[PDB]
Amino acid sequence: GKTFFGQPLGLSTLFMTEMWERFSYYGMRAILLYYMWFLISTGDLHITRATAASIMAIYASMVYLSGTIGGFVADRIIGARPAVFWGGVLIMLGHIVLALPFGASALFGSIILIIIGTGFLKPNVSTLVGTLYDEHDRRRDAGFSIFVFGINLGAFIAPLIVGAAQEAAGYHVAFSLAAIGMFIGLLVYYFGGKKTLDPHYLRPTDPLAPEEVKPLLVKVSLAVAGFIAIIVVMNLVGWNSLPAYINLLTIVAIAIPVFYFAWMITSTEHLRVVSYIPLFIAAVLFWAIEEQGSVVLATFAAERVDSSWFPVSWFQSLNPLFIMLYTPFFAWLWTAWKKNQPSSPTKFAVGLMFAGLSFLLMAIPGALYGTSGKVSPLWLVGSWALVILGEMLISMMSMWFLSSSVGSALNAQLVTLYNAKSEVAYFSYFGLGSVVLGIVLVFLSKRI
Ligand SMILES: CCCCCCC/C=C\CCCCCC(=O)OC[C@H](CO)O[C@@H](O)[C@H](O)COC(=O)CCCCC/C=C\CCCCCCC
Ligand SMILES: CCCCCCC/C=C/CCCCCC(=O)OC[C@@H](O)CO
Ligand SMILES: CCCCCCC/C=C\CCCCCC(=O)OC[C@@H](O)CO
Ligand SMILES: CCCCCCC/C=C\CCCCCC(=O)OC[C@@H](O)CO
Ligand SMILES: CCCCCCC/C=C\CCCCCC(=O)OC[C@@H](O)CO
Ligand SMILES: CCCCCCC/C=C\CCCCCC(=O)OC[C@@H](O)CO
Ligand SMILES: CCCCCCC/C=C\CCCCCC(=O)OC[C@@H](O)CO
Ligand SMILES: CCCCCCC/C=C\CCCCCC(=O)OC[C@@H](O)CO
Ligand SMILES: CCCCCCC/C=C\CCCCCC(=O)OC[C@@H](O)CO
Ligand SMILES: CCCCCCC/C=C\CCCCCC(=O)OC[C@@H](O)CO
Ligand SMILES: CCCCCCC/C=C\CCCCCC(=O)OC[C@@H](O)CO
Ligand SMILES: CCCCCCC/C=C\CCCCCC(=O)OC[C@@H](O)CO
Ligand SMILES: CCCCCCC/C=C\CCCCCC(=O)OC[C@@H](O)CO
Ligand SMILES: CCCCCCC/C=C\CCCCCC(=O)OC[C@@H](O)CO
Ligand SMILES: CCCCCCC/C=C\CCCCCC(=O)OC[C@@H](O)CO
Ligand SMILES: CCCCCCC/C=C\CCCCCC(=O)OC[C@@H](O)CO
Ligand SMILES: CCCCCCC/C=C\CCCCCC(=O)OC[C@@H](O)CO
Ligand SMILES: CCCCCCC/C=C\CCCCCC(=O)OC[C@@H](O)CO
Ligand SMILES: CCCCCCC/C=C\CCCCCC(=O)OC[C@@H](O)CO
């Protein structure tokens, strides 16, 4: 019968839903840092470029953090299908905010809308893909990999199309193209979902029982009161700058996995959960390096690369390109070697080493040529080729949304250290430190 690459026809609707949301997201993130540079250069935005880079990292940290609870809200309160739809609306509104004739005054409102919108949509589109397959269906893994190919496809074309529109027609037009991309996703999702999506997921699948509503409200109200109380105290003692608020979000993002480790401590399982700790830190450190490609590598591309004949935002397409080119090779690898199946602690060790090698490579051109001129774009290509190879090995998602959030929160502190005089030392020591910790994991692989 008629399938979508051997999968139920409903996969195409969700395939295109996420390709276009990822289009809006990574198109925005390819030009947002340069947009803040522009607002700084005109005097509209009164922050340093280091603070602007810090914003990008903590921006990514909250998006991943908000995705840790979007599954709860859909499953228990609103439903998986309304969560994707109203999440997509909030994402679209966030990009429309940046297309309006405003300046720095619209940055926070657009960031808030997209943080919340992506939390509703991103975990619940992945959930709805599973609802196309029963527990029995072997096609579940193949359908998810086809779904991920649409993720990288949207992430690939977005910097090319959005970045070119920025250079040709300006920032406001480019940001409006991001909003249009999400709108395209909403059209296909709404009308397409109604034709092929189970109406069971228009409602929550585990709705709150009558006695569950009150303690959930108390839990939510206590967290909001405490967080607000901290901001109140911060203003009375004088810790009230933008970096101070960024530092607050950094601490909250890192304290969540630490507190969930500190008292989650049954010798049955107490040490087989201490198991997962040397690998959660390996994932945090890999994700930090990977997410600096949109920040530090975006800075290097605009400052240290002879790229005069094409938009510098296009470098952000190298990340999802290498994911697409590596994927069929590794699918072959994980089945061609039916009896190798290297252990997950070893893959995470070697994966972190490749990420460290990606930064070690970027220390060479500055050390060899100096930091005052410009070098070939192939240095950045080699860097992304090495860090994505580390991703192919590391291949509840909220926990994986979490290590992404903490690594990005760690970036909000480190990326302020990067500049022209910092370049070689920055790349050489965060790359070496990541490689040494990857070898330390080798010594402890199944010390577990
Ligand atoms: C069948 C797949 C095999 C692919 C693995 C090989 C990696 C692919 C390409 C490596 C190309 C080597 C670099 C070429 C070179 O040396 O540059 C020559 C060029 C002459 O015009 O000049 C320079 O001007 C440049 O300025 C000098 O600087 C460097 O070349 C430093 C290069 C950085 C080190 C890279 C060395 C080896 C990479 C091997 C990675 C293999 C990893 C596979 C898992
Ligand atoms: C998606 C971004 C990847 C871009 C990869 C580009 C690979 C180019 C390699 C050659 C180095 C730059 C050569 C400069 C050049 O030839 O410009 C032509 C001439 O006008 C000099 O400016
Ligand atoms: C307008 C200012 C607020 C912006 C909204 C940002 C909300 C972001 C994050 C709140 C979620 C924090 C709780 C996440 C959490 O603890 O889950 C982790 C747990 O699921 C691990 O699996
Ligand atoms: C209108 C307000 C903005 C939109 C509301 C959604 C804001 C995001 C989260 C609100 C908290 C809901 C409860 C989430 C929660 O308890 O997470 C627990 C965690 O274990 C999830 O697995
Ligand atoms: C700024 C835009 C305002 C909102 C415009 C869109 C609201 C118009 C009609 C409400 C549609 C709600 C549909 C919610 C939903 O679950 O859709 C899921 C989709 O699969 C269709 O069932
Ligand atoms: C329980 C709540 C957890 C913490 C969630 C709070 C996250 C809310 C907002 C994060 C936005 C990051 C900072 C945005 C920003 O600095 O842009 C505004 C700035 O350009 C104005 O000068
Ligand atoms: C389909 C509904 C949501 C999709 C977005 C619809 C609106 C998108 C674009 C409309 C025009 C964008 C405004 C462009 C703009 O004003 O900037 C250019 C100009 O101000 C600078 O010279
Ligand atoms: C200044 C630019 C306009 C700003 C407002 C843009 C809102 C325009 C249209 C809202 C699109 C709603 C989501 C698209 C969709 O497919 O919804 C279908 C559903 O509402 C039909 O019942
Ligand atoms: C930051 C502002 C957030 C405002 C909205 C957050 C609300 C969070 C928790 C309240 C959940 C109460 C929902 C009750 C509900 O819908 O179920 C009712 C029914 O199932 C009980 O019999
Ligand atoms: C539940 C216990 C509450 C105790 C307080 C919890 C939060 C403690 C400190 C939050 C500090 C916010 C970030 C630190 C900060 O403001 O640094 C200021 C500095 O960057 C210049 O203003
Ligand atoms: C999440 C629960 C509701 C919290 C209500 C209060 C939220 C206030 C701030 C959240 C963190 C965002 C901080 C970014 C910011 O406001 O920068 C302002 C900047 O001008 C500093 O002067
Ligand atoms: C008993 C609980 C375990 C032991 C407590 C461990 C500390 C818990 C949370 C602290 C989070 C780490 C601090 C965040 C951080 O490293 O950045 C600091 C920076 O943002 C301040 O400028
Ligand atoms: C298989 C890897 C190929 C070689 C990778 C090892 C590269 C080691 C160092 C990068 C080239 C160093 C350039 C020379 C240098 O940095 O010294 C500069 C300094 O002595 C001048 O004051
Ligand atoms: C070949 C694949 C892996 C790529 C990494 C191989 C290169 C390893 C390390 C290169 C870093 C060399 C650092 C040289 C250096 O810092 O010199 C200091 C001085 O020249 C600049 O301040
Ligand atoms: C798996 C792939 C590993 C990649 C290995 C790392 C190779 C990275 C950079 C090689 C730099 C060579 C650049 C020299 C070049 O061809 O252009 C000349 C330059 O002057 C033009 O601007
Ligand atoms: C097991 C949980 C994983 C935790 C990973 C994060 C490691 C904990 C704390 C990292 C603190 C980084 C502080 C960065 C720093 O101080 O330097 C940058 C600073 O100069 C920016 O002003
Ligand atoms: C010598 C340390 C043990 C070797 C472990 C192998 C690690 C992988 C590649 C070699 C990295 C060399 C980094 C060189 C370095 O850190 O120099 C820093 C430079 O800024 C000072 O000149
Ligand atoms: C065990 C978990 C590791 C996670 C955090 C790893 C890095 C922590 C702190 C780094 C901040 C110290 C800054 C060291 C430094 O000087 O680097 C900057 C230098 O490369 C350029 O000037
Ligand atoms: C300056 C030297 C640069 C190259 C050094 C990197 C290679 C040297 C040693 C790597 C292997 C060290 C021993 C690791 C090992 O096999 O531990 C046993 C472990 O596999 C069992 O879990």
Short mmCIF file of C-alpha atoms in Angstrom, two decimals, residues 189-391:
data_model
loop_
_atom_site.label_atom_id
_atom_site.label_comp_id
_atom_site.label_asym_id
_atom_site.label_seq_id
_atom_site.Cartn_x
_atom_site.Cartn_y
_atom_site.Cartn_z
CA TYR A 189 0.06 20.02 10.86
CA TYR A 190 -3.49 21.26 11.46
CA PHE A 191 -5.13 20.12 8.22
CA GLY A 192 -2.86 17.10 7.81
CA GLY A 193 -3.17 15.94 11.41
CA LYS A 194 -6.97 16.03 11.30
CA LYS A 195 -6.83 13.51 8.43
CA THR A 196 -4.38 10.97 9.87
CA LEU A 197 -3.84 11.62 13.61
CA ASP A 198 -5.67 9.62 16.26
CA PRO A 199 -8.28 11.94 17.86
CA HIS A 200 -7.41 10.25 21.18
CA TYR A 201 -4.49 12.69 21.48
CA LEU A 202 -6.66 15.81 21.27
CA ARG A 203 -7.09 15.28 25.03
CA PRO A 204 -4.67 14.37 27.83
CA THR A 205 -4.03 10.64 28.10
CA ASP A 206 -3.39 10.73 31.87
CA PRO A 207 -5.69 13.53 33.06
CA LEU A 208 -5.32 14.84 36.59
CA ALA A 209 -7.49 13.08 39.13
CA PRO A 210 -9.67 15.36 41.30
CA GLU A 211 -7.34 15.09 44.31
CA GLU A 212 -4.23 15.78 42.20
CA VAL A 213 -5.12 19.35 41.20
CA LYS A 214 -4.51 21.04 44.55
CA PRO A 215 -0.99 19.68 45.30
CA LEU A 216 0.11 20.46 41.74
CA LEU A 217 -1.07 24.05 42.23
CA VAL A 218 0.76 24.29 45.57
CA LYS A 219 3.92 22.85 44.01
CA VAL A 220 3.78 25.33 41.12
CA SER A 221 2.95 28.30 43.37
CA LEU A 222 5.79 27.52 45.79
CA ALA A 223 8.31 27.42 42.93
CA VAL A 224 7.08 30.73 41.50
CA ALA A 225 7.06 32.44 44.90
CA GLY A 226 10.60 31.30 45.68
CA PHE A 227 11.98 32.28 42.27
CA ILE A 228 10.31 35.69 42.53
CA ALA A 229 11.61 36.07 46.09
CA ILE A 230 15.16 35.48 44.84
CA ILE A 231 14.80 38.19 42.19
CA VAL A 232 13.44 40.51 44.90
CA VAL A 233 16.42 39.82 47.18
CA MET A 234 18.83 40.27 44.26
CA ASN A 235 17.55 43.80 43.63
CA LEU A 236 17.90 44.85 47.27
CA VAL A 237 21.56 43.76 47.52
CA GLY A 238 22.48 45.16 44.10
CA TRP A 239 22.77 42.00 41.97
CA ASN A 240 20.57 43.28 39.19
CA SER A 241 22.52 43.48 35.92
CA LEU A 242 21.73 41.33 32.91
CA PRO A 243 24.70 39.02 33.68
CA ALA A 244 23.39 38.65 37.24
CA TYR A 245 20.05 37.39 35.92
CA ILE A 246 21.93 35.17 33.46
CA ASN A 247 23.94 33.84 36.40
CA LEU A 248 20.67 33.12 38.21
CA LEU A 249 19.38 31.03 35.30
CA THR A 250 22.77 29.29 35.10
CA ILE A 251 22.57 28.22 38.75
CA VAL A 252 18.94 27.08 38.48
CA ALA A 253 19.68 25.05 35.34
CA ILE A 254 22.64 23.29 36.99
CA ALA A 255 21.03 22.85 40.42
CA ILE A 256 18.15 20.80 38.94
CA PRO A 257 20.21 17.70 37.96
CA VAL A 258 22.36 18.11 41.09
CA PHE A 259 19.43 18.09 43.52
CA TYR A 260 17.85 15.21 41.59
CA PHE A 261 21.14 13.35 42.09
CA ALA A 262 21.75 14.30 45.73
CA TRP A 263 18.69 12.76 47.38
CA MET A 264 17.58 10.25 44.70
CA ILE A 265 20.22 8.27 46.53
CA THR A 266 18.33 0.35 47.92
CA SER A 267 21.93 -0.69 47.28
CA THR A 268 20.22 -2.70 44.55
CA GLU A 269 20.11 0.48 42.48
CA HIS A 270 22.04 3.13 44.45
CA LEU A 271 25.32 2.44 42.63
CA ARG A 272 23.76 1.50 39.29
CA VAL A 273 22.44 5.06 39.29
CA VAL A 274 25.81 6.40 40.40
CA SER A 275 26.57 4.46 37.21
CA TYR A 276 25.03 7.16 35.02
CA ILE A 277 26.91 10.09 36.64
CA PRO A 278 30.29 9.87 34.80
CA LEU A 279 28.26 9.81 31.55
CA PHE A 280 25.83 12.64 32.32
CA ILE A 281 28.88 14.86 32.86
CA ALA A 282 30.32 13.56 29.58
CA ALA A 283 27.07 14.49 27.84
CA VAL A 284 27.00 17.93 29.49
CA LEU A 285 30.53 18.64 28.27
CA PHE A 286 29.86 17.37 24.75
CA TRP A 287 26.65 19.39 24.39
CA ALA A 288 28.45 22.52 25.61
CA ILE A 289 31.02 22.17 22.82
CA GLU A 290 28.35 21.36 20.22
CA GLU A 291 26.16 24.34 21.15
CA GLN A 292 29.12 26.73 21.03
CA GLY A 293 29.06 26.28 17.25
CA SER A 294 26.19 28.77 17.08
CA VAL A 295 28.06 31.16 19.39
CA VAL A 296 31.86 30.87 19.41
CA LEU A 297 32.19 29.32 15.95
CA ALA A 298 29.67 31.86 14.66
CA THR A 299 31.93 34.58 16.08
CA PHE A 300 35.06 33.06 14.51
CA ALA A 301 33.29 32.78 11.14
CA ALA A 302 32.32 36.46 11.11
CA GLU A 303 35.71 37.72 12.33
CA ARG A 304 38.51 35.34 11.30
CA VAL A 305 37.41 33.77 7.98
CA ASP A 306 37.74 35.15 4.46
CA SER A 307 34.09 34.58 3.53
CA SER A 308 33.36 37.70 1.46
CA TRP A 309 31.39 35.91 -1.28
CA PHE A 310 28.57 34.32 0.74
CA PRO A 311 26.64 35.05 3.95
CA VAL A 312 28.57 34.03 7.05
CA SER A 313 25.36 32.66 8.61
CA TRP A 314 25.59 29.73 6.17
CA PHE A 315 28.30 28.11 8.31
CA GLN A 316 25.58 26.96 10.72
CA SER A 317 24.40 24.54 8.01
CA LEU A 318 27.57 22.46 8.41
CA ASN A 319 26.25 21.00 11.68
CA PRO A 320 23.07 19.33 10.31
CA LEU A 321 24.81 18.53 7.02
CA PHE A 322 27.42 16.31 8.67
CA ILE A 323 24.65 14.66 10.71
CA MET A 324 22.89 13.74 7.46
CA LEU A 325 26.06 12.53 5.72
CA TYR A 326 27.24 10.48 8.71
CA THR A 327 23.89 8.86 9.53
CA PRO A 328 23.62 6.09 6.86
CA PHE A 329 27.25 5.13 7.46
CA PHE A 330 26.61 4.66 11.19
CA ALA A 331 23.34 2.81 10.59
CA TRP A 332 25.43 0.41 8.51
CA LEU A 333 28.08 0.41 11.26
CA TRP A 334 25.71 -0.49 14.10
CA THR A 335 24.47 -3.47 12.06
CA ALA A 336 27.50 -4.41 9.92
CA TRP A 337 29.26 -5.09 13.22
CA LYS A 338 26.50 -7.23 14.67
CA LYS A 339 28.89 -8.54 17.35
CA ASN A 340 30.90 -5.43 18.16
CA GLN A 341 28.12 -3.26 19.75
CA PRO A 342 30.65 -1.09 21.64
CA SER A 343 29.46 -0.21 25.12
CA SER A 344 27.67 3.08 25.72
CA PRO A 345 30.29 4.30 28.28
CA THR A 346 32.99 3.81 25.63
CA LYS A 347 30.99 5.64 22.95
CA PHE A 348 30.46 8.59 25.29
CA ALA A 349 34.17 8.60 26.13
CA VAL A 350 35.31 8.57 22.49
CA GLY A 351 32.51 10.98 21.62
CA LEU A 352 33.79 13.58 24.07
CA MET A 353 37.32 13.09 22.72
CA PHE A 354 36.17 13.99 19.21
CA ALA A 355 34.50 17.14 20.55
CA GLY A 356 37.76 18.05 22.28
CA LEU A 357 39.60 17.39 19.02
CA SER A 358 37.22 19.78 17.25
CA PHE A 359 38.40 22.61 19.50
CA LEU A 360 42.05 21.52 19.44
CA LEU A 361 41.94 21.87 15.65
CA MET A 362 40.66 25.45 15.94
CA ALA A 363 43.73 26.46 17.97
CA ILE A 364 46.09 25.66 15.07
CA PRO A 365 45.34 28.53 12.62
CA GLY A 366 45.71 31.23 15.27
CA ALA A 367 48.89 29.62 16.60
CA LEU A 368 50.37 29.24 13.10
CA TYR A 369 49.12 32.38 11.31
CA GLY A 370 48.23 34.78 14.12
CA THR A 371 44.83 36.12 15.14
CA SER A 372 44.92 39.42 13.22
CA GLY A 373 44.27 38.06 9.71
CA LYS A 374 41.75 35.68 8.19
CA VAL A 375 42.02 31.96 7.47
CA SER A 376 40.31 29.45 5.19
CA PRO A 377 36.69 28.39 5.81
CA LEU A 378 37.91 24.77 5.74
CA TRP A 379 39.12 25.12 9.34
CA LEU A 380 35.50 25.48 10.46
CA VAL A 381 34.48 22.59 8.19
CA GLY A 382 37.06 20.37 9.86
CA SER A 383 35.85 21.50 13.28
CA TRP A 384 32.20 20.65 12.59
CA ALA A 385 33.22 17.36 10.95
CA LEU A 386 34.98 16.34 14.17
CA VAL A 387 32.30 17.42 16.65
CA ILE A 388 29.44 15.80 14.71
CA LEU A 389 31.42 12.54 14.61
CA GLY A 390 31.32 12.81 18.40
CA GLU A 391 27.55 13.27 18.21
#
